Fold this sequence. Notes:
Keywords (chains B, C): ATP-binding, Metal-binding, Nucleotide-binding
Strand content of chain A: under 5%
Structural class of chain B: alpha/beta
Binding site for ATP 2 (chains B, C): 24-25, 27, 56-62, 217, 220-221, 279-280, 283
Binding site for Mg(2+) 2 (chains B, C): 61, 168
Largest sheet of chain B: 5 strands, parallel
Largest interface: B-C, 59 and 49 residues
Radius of gyration of chain B: 23 Å
Helix content of chain A: 55-70%
Oligomer: part of a larger assembly
Bound molecules: adenosine-5'-triphosphate, magnesium ion
Order of helices and strands of chain B: HHEHEHHEHEHEHHHHHH
Binding site for Mg(2+) 3 (chains B, C): 61, 168-169
Binding site for ATP 1 (chains B, C): 21, 24-25, 57-62, 279
Amino acid sequence: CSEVREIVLSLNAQGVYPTEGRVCELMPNPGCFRYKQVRAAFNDARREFGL
Amino acid sequence: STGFPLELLTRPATERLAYFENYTVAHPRLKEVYEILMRTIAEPAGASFIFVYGASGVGKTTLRLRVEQKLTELALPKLESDRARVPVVGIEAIAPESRYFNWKEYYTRALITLEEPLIDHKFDYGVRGISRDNFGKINVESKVVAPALRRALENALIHRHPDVFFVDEAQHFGKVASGYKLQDQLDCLKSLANMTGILHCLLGTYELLTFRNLSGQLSRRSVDIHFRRYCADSPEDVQAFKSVLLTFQQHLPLAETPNLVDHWEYFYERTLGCIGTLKDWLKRVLSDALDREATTITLKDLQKRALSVAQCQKMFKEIQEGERQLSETEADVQNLRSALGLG
Amino acid sequence: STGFPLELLTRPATERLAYFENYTVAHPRLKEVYEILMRTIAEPAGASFIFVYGASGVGKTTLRLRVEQKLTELALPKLESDRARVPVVGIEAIAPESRYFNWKEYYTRALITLEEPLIDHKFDYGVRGISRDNFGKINVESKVVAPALRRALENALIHRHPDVFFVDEAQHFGKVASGYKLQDQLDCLKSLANMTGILHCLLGTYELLTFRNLSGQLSRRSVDIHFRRYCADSPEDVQAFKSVLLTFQQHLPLAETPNLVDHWEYFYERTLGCIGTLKDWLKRVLSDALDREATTITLKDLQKRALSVAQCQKMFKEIQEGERQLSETEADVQNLRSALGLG
Ligand SMILES: Nc1ncnc2c1ncn2[C@@H]1O[C@H](COP(=O)(O)OP(=O)(O)OP(=O)(O)O)[C@@H](O)[C@H]1O
Ligand SMILES: Nc1ncnc2c1ncn2[C@@H]1O[C@H](COP(=O)(O)OP(=O)(O)OP(=O)(O)O)[C@@H](O)[C@H]1O
Ligand SMILES: [Mg+2]
Ligand SMILES: [Mg+2]
């Protein structure tokens, strides 16, 4: 979850739209979102930032 | 005195040009329109639309800026108690690059200008797309549908509650394809102004007259204000134009004050009585005079930066049609009373 | 001296050809049109459009190049310290492959041309899709919709505040559908030019007169400049044409200067008095003369590379049609006064 938040930070810094696929492209195991709190953390980080 | 300060003669030509550009004349027409518009804004009382008709160069935009400034000044004392409350927000309609006016872009830009006081306040609109960024500017994703943007704008407008919503160049709302009724695009704004409760002031030229009276609902919730030019038939308007010209001549930053009232016919001919056009003409002539470092204004110098006869004829034709459409006489009142059966 | 340097005679034909190509002559019409254009650019004063009508071959493009160069030279002392500013940005309208003018491509190419000052200058467009690639070039995603590109261009133009947005070959704006009004295209350009506050200069041939005086708002914010040709019906233009022929004949890089003044009727016949056409004709004739290594220029050489009578009879008809609508007489002034009641 911590790397998920950090990756969404880094992706939103450059202005590119942070989506699930784009974040997955920057993970060693782009399948961790099947856990139902990694996705929750990603959604919370996006919604705090305004998506 | 009543003229420009004499210290400006030693200042560079740029300073004199800036001073003349910033100068504003309080001629009777602008004053009266200002009082009527601010009285309407102070209390709309059911009306949702304000139509400020006028020619090109009468001074509609400067009137809007003056009204915005004075509204902000009046809301400054009350802003200390109730925060997150925009006093006035104003945008300009965009002439579309396609055959239809883009409502999505209108909503996006209205949201951008309205919801940018500063970063200290957050509202958390009900739609996911709209958000701020690291630069402090609102960016709206292209995937946000138009009804969602409309709902977000409605929520933001309800929260902020500006006194009036200015829409400059409202004649661009008439850019529709064949078979599309102009009434529908007016109800599109009327519904927003009704479910939101924010007065909308539409400023535009005589092309805005196509939105004058489209339905009974749109005629009830509308205030009609005519920014009128100066005519040559009535001696009072001629005297007002001469007074404005004399005031302009006193406030022209030149070493020797030019004589400018005597050539009042030539000015009215190429200006059509609009103070904005005359101000632009005098600004151009003053810039040329300072470019050569002249000491006065000569008739040929005015002849240089004068609008062509064809341009003036076109503007006068549209002014004639607009004034004919907007003329109210006792015959119309009597016909209305006879139709109402009030004899 | 008054002619080409005598050292060029020993140089290869390429050097002489390039010297003739790069040579320019300041005839009275060009100097007058340049002074008018620069005075209008310096102080638009409520003008958002500058139409420069002229025949095909009068020198509109070289006038634009000269104005851009002189503006850049003026801004260079200020650009030494101040940065993030472009003095002048120039674009050329594109004739569409389809029936309708492509506004999406106009915004894309305007954004590309305007925003290439330096890789260091980074500014946020506020729209996702436009950025700079690995080659330091502006790339716009094909999924970016035209209103978004318009908003990005508006933000860039406001940020960079160029003095004038030149739009050459502006007659290509008229490539619109039969059901599309030409006033709407001008309104779309005027809206950008007004929210951006950037003066727009439209250069084109007499086909651009279809964009002349479409409304009172597009007439007041318009400064029509006519790049008039030389006419044989008045001795003054004939003398000017003879003088320009004299300086051209004395600046031709040849061992023996050809006598061009005697055959001035022939040169006017195939050029209609325009300077660019005569310059290109002389350039061609000199190229053929130097290919054969001719000591001078013969009439037959001029006939070899001249324009056919069928070619000239169409350009001359277009010039007549354009000059008919660009002529102002005292009768028009009296009609305007009578309409305004100023008699
Ligand atoms: N009362 C005034 N006193 C001084 N300057 C004025 C006045 N009214 C307008 N101007 C000048 O006119 C210019 C702005 O144009 P103006 O506000 O008259 O146009 P508008 O009629 O509202 O707009 P549009 O022509 O697009 O419909 C500015 O240079 C401004 O200084
Ligand atoms: N005053 C001038 N002195 C010298 N050469 C000139 C002058 N005006 C134009 N030319 C030359 O004429 C040629 C073409 O003219 P130019 O491109 O300026 O015309 P234009 O008005 O833009 O034409 P068009 O509308 O047909 O595209 C060029 O080789 C240019 O150098
Ligand atoms: Mg305005
Ligand atoms: Mg050209």
